[PDB]
Ligand binder design. Structure first.
Ligand code: 1QS
Ligand code: 1QS
Lengths: 464, 465
């Protein structure tokens, strides 16, 4: 079972002894520090609060466990047993902490306060930064949500240009990343952040996370359809790729189905197998049950263009109202090899240059904490009853300078966001603080449904 | 609770309908595909124990999956019968056999590392159902490998500048807890780092190792007290010296690291440590050094400038190799921007400036991906209508993605290297014993390794010498 006393950087175990004597408050904040990616989607704190921070997170057994582990880990007695026992005894193991945050799904420019943390009991001055490590992992859902939103902007631009509308945009970037992430827990979190932006996923772990921690009106937040993998083709033997294809499309004759076609020769598969031998099985399919051909190797742009060129000569192509070529409704393509934000752009731009509609294609999808510079810093403390504004400001890197004092987030006269420092929010010159109390003394005090998060994270173009 | 029926890529739910009819066996393998020439095999045992072993199928889990997939696919495609069979016939234990190279083994790219096959003909579909969960072993493999390569660099330069490898296992400390994607990842990643080193701040790694692997020592990893920017800055911008003095006095008898770049790293080293507080430093024991931590600026330039500063404020000696060495009560740690490329740049830069690597330690925490070592799971053999056939992919535009054929086995070559035999050629017995061992069979873990054996297996040659 998870033990919050063992869920911090080791050195933080020793910090309670290092603050100035008589420190009663430590107040810290999280921002995506300013230096592409000018605005970030704030998403994922709610998961952390509920799974790890709320309720009785301290017990006698957990304190004894940490005591024993840290004795061996430090080869010495340094663990703050008394501090944790106090929280156990005084607050029945609930954390005397208050956290204020921007609403989940909000799109905010870099360099703004996203959330703040402070102790609500003077005895627990040391607790604010103990939980830095766990709260900072919010960088991941934030960065995933942000990066996927940036990809969606690109797809929307090109789909709108080549087709005149945004029909199907939310199914244009399917999550294929389950096997490529570092753990089961990460798969769930990352998939949930993808699903803020899209509705097609193969990462099943995302559905349960969303249902447990966020909630949707619909039974599930994400969908998929049947498809082959290389093993269901290659198992038939090298000479029987056609038999494989025929069997699979016949098994899934009235639902969409995607079939990886590059096991031996993508160009032959498209031109001769799909385009000639099995063509009669494809042109007979319903608009609701297209075959989606999947190339999966070679240069992604070159291969997509060649595949379209091949299919365009074997199948009846139309020209839509914007003048772009469109495959018949029972035939589409999906490319999931090598697709990052850069190549996605390259492919849609290249399709556009060859007069191919983005209607024809869908895509299948490492980010670090450094990408958006997600950082947690102490900005205000109270020692001997006097408040002081604190910050780092390293001489050799002005970009690492942190914010000073009590912080608040505000709407500007032009309707933008601004972060006020040094408690200046209290001057009431910028109206109300936009942060909301989301956690206080062991309880989640404000939360958001996945439907509302999705709404908050919409593109302007979707808002029309 | 975790549900194996919900722990696969969605499309794999539909594959049981796609294999050739009359298929009784699907046999698949994992390799770090050739295109980091040797990889540390580590982490499978965790997955086996946490997710695959025991009664992993129940009536409730089958129903939960049926319900989820009905909505997810908007269709009934889930193989309820197949899972029911496992529940009824095997008390919910997976009829799968997994054979793997021992954990810790250091194996060249392009070799079979583990194989998976169904042990019951009805469960031909199950082999690849669990590809997704097993392929996540790419992560501890790649972390263990990447840290081993950083250890090789440190070893080379420590040996060259000092004449020995003393303290090598504490030269790269794990700082990465906050920078990973999740709590679970933190434990897995820390455990892979600990295959190579002993200093860690990622506590999660210790519990994982104790639960899934085990060590003779009480814990596999260690740390010492240290400040963070907050415990310095909280004193106020005018009181950095007061913060330093308080902290080193609180930890007067144990090693302590103190981040010194809050305002001006060069002033802090030359004037605060080097003059105002020097008397509190030179009095420290060799078992309790102060470890100064810069944390900004160009990593190489900042490290050299910090050493140059300290070298003029403190008594430097020259070791038998001709390199400069700070007095034993004073050391440096660089934990900002340290990846494998910059680690190399720093130690080489230090060597050029005649500074021993004894003076410095590093902290870790671009990302490693599954593409780095090309970790991949592929079907190589099936039995259909009672006939074994060797299967594989071989995409025309990318020979690098060609996969291996048939039943596989891993062997020592006559010169002591490794070779993977394809097409069941291992059966000829021309290359001695298959090095893959059965680690999982029919819901039971059949062979396990302690963390101690793994560390021994993953040792560097320079350590062996
Ligand atoms: O094919 C796979 N999954 C199935 C799939 C099929 C089509 C589409 S689509 O976007 O064309 C589509 C989406 C949808 F929800 C409704 C549709 F009608 C059309 C998306 C997803 C697949 C492939 C490689 C892979 N690697 C790891 C996991 N992986 C899964
Ligand atoms: O200072 C930190 N942890 C403490 C620390 C102190 C010294 C050494 S050392 O390698 O000098 C050392 C190791 C050891 F085990 C025995 C020693 F005597 C000497 C390593 C680690 C720290 C700093 C930044 C950070 N970000 C996230 C987590 N973080 C932790």
């Amino acid at each position: 079972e998870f033990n919050i006393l063992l869920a911090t950087d080791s050195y933080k175990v020793t910090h309670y002894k290092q603050y100035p004597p008589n420190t009663s408050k430590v107040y810290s904040y999280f921002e995506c520090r300013e230096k592409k990616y000018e605005e970030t989607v704030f998403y994922g704190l709610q998961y952390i609060l509920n799974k790890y921070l709320k309720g009785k997170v301290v017990t006698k057994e957990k304190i004894q466990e940490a005591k024993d582990v840290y004795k061996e880990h430090f080869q010495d007695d340094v663990f703050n047993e008394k501090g944790w026992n106090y929280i156990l005894e005084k607050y029945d193991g609930h954390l005397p902490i208050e956290i204020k945050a921007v609403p989940e799904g909000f799109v905010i420019p870099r360099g703004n306060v996203l959330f703040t943390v402070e102790n609500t009991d003077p005895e627990c001055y040391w607790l604010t930064n103990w939980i830095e490590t766990i709260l900072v992992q919010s960088w991941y859902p934030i960065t995933v949500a942000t990066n996927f939103r940036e990809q969606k902007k690109i797809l929307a631009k090109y789909l709108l240009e080549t087709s005149g509308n945004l029909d199907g945009l939310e199914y244009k970037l399917h999550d294929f990343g389950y096997r490529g992430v570092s753990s089961q827990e990460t798969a769930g979190i990352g998939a949930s952040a993808h699903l803020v932006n899209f509705k097609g996923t193969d990462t099943v772990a995302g559905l349960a996370l969303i249902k447990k921690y966020y909630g949707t009106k619909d039974p599930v937040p994400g969908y998929s359809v049947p498809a082959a993998e290389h093993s269901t083709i290659t198992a038939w033997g090298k000479d029987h790729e056609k038999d494989a294809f025929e069997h699979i499309v016949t098994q899934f004759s009235s639902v969409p189905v995607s079939v990886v076609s590059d096991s031996y020769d993508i160009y032959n598969a498209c031109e001769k197998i799909w385009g000639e031998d099995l063509r009669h099985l494809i042109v007979s399919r319903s608009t609701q049950a297209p075959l989606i051909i999947r190339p999966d190797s070679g240069n992604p742009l070159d291969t997509v263009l060649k595949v379209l060129e091949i299919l365009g000569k074997k199948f009846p192509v139309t020209e839509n109202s914007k003048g772009y070529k469109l495959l018949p409704p029972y035939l589409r393509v999906i490319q999931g090899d090598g697709v990052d934000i850069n190549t996605l752009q390259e492919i849609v731009e290249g399709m556009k240059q060859k007069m191919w509609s983005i209607e024809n294609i869908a895509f299948g999808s490492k980010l670090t904490r450094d990408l958006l510079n997600c950082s947690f810093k102490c900005s205000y403390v109270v020692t001997n009853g006097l408040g002081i504004n604190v910050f780092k400001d390293p001489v050799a890197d002005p970009n690492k300078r942190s914010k000073k004092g009590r912080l608040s987030l505000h709407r500007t006269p032009a309707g933008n966001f601004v972060t006020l420092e040094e408690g200046k929010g209290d001057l009431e010159e910028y109206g109300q603080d936009l942060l909301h109390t989301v956690f206080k003394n062991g309880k989640v005090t404000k939360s958001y449904s996945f439907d509302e998060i999705r709404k908050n994270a919409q593109l302007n173009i979707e808002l029309e």
